[PDB]
Structure 1
Amino acid sequence: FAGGLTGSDYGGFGGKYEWDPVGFSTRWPEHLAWYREAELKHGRIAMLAFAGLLAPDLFRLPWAEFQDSSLDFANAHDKFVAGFGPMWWGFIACGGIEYQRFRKLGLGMEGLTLENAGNLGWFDLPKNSEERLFYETAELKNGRLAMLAVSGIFTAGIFWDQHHFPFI
């Protein structure tokens, strides 16, 4: 199921889950590299997003334009981008990192396969070979959860007008 990708296996009371109840993997097997790459990159950003909304509430960056109150998660976007602003500082940074991914897998991402997907090569904590399998599932399980978490955060916080960690 989905090549040798680690989304299933070590996945709860059952050893393997293999949740693909639309067949987006069997129907499009050439994109399992793309799907993993997207699934992982979604998880990492969502995890930074959720851990994002909380930390500005305590510390603020020394940019001295972000050093202002009332910049909650419903107005920080439309406020910083100016007539340019901090949001472009972040976007340029994300361009620098994303350009690195292009070099490793070629321009058309031809080198992207079902084993190198979502593997930028930053190996500091992991050890051994089975832990990498265990950590890869621990990555996704956290990542998939935060993707739904920040989804609930953004919708509930702006609908019910919470804008803070309880988001209720």
Structure 2
Amino acid sequence: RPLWFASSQSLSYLDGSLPGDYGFDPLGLSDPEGTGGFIEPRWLAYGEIINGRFAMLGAAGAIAPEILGKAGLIPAETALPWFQTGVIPPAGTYTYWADNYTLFVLEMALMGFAEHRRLQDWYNPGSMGKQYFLGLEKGLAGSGNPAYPGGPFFNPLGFGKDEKSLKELKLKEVKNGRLAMLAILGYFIQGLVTGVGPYQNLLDHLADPVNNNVLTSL
């Protein structure tokens, strides 16, 4: 297998079982010696997968309204950058059907239901498919692997029927998630120093790459 900044310590426990494994661990955070707390290989892999999925949802979301505004498809009052949509009211605010602090409570409650069920399945595998939940517990039984639950709810189309195809698709998921985390960090620090949306930043770079660049922005 290809290797990327591997070391003698890191290769002693990264044997290639995990998807998207290249032996990269300079700090040895996943060393199985004395695992405890939140520093644990299984928890670290699960966290990487979940963060990748959430960043992949966020990376396209923070730019989808902006490009359609410059394309003249959505009204200009909704083509706001991600930092002037109500996330940071000091930077700007938009008036929705409810005040922002009210929406926060509803989001908190729904996300609490979903995430508490996910955590309780992580703690006790197969526990969420036992107690009566509106008759939806029949499909929320999980599969024994916390990161890949499958089932009629989380695998509707039935992709990845073959195990080799499943491994390839897991590798693709990991790669795309890592790329999306990088893009999200780029979003944050681009917004910090240029003070304008990432799509406009890309258009600025395309217009003139030498006058509109880091050497001229910082």
**TM-score computed with the length of structure 1 as normaliser:** 0.71
2:161 counterpart of 1:148: no
Identity of aligned residues (%): 27
Cα distance in 2, alignment partners of residues 23 and 83 from structure 1: 41
Letter paired with 1:72: P
2:173 counterpart of 1:116: no
Cα distance in 1, alignment partners of residues 108 and 201 from structure 2: 26
| Larger RCO: 1 or 2 (CA < 8 Å, sep 6+) | 1
SS in 1 for 2:102: coil
State the Cα deviation string for residues 63-97 of structure 1 (Å, max 9, x = none): xxxx9547421132134763513x44444333232
Residue aligning to 1:34: 43
Q: Which runs of 5+ in 1 are unaligned?
A: 9-16, 60-66
Residue aligning to 1:62: none
> Which of 57, 68, 86 does residue 48 from structure 1 map onto?
57
State the Cα deviation string for residues 132-163 of structure 1 (Å, max 9, x = none): 11111111111011101111012102321221
In the TM superposition, structure 1's runs of 4+ consecutive aligned residues that sit over 6 Å from their partners are none
Query: Alpha carbons of 1:104 and 1:73: their partners in 2 closer, same or farther (altered >3 Å)?
Result: same
Cα distance in 1, alignment partners of residues 59 and 23 from structure 2: 26
Letter paired with 2:65: P
Structure with higher Rg: it is 2
Cα distance in 1, alignment partners of residues 186 and 61 from structure 2: 14
Letter paired with 1:84: T
Letter paired with 1:21: P
Say which structure is richer in helix.
2
Please tell me whether the aligned partners of residues 50 and 149 of structure 1 are also in contact (alpha carbons under 8 angstroms).
yes
Residue aligning to 1:75: 84
Please tell me whether the aligned partners of residues 7 and 18 of structure 1 are also in contact (alpha carbons under 8 angstroms).
no
Query: Alpha carbons of 1:53 and 1:128: their partners in 2 closer, same or farther (altered >3 Å)?
Result: same
Q: CA RMSD in A?
A: 2.9
Letter paired with 1:24: L
Residues matched between the structures, number: 146
How far residue 99 of structure 1 moved from its aligned partner, in angstroms, is 2.4
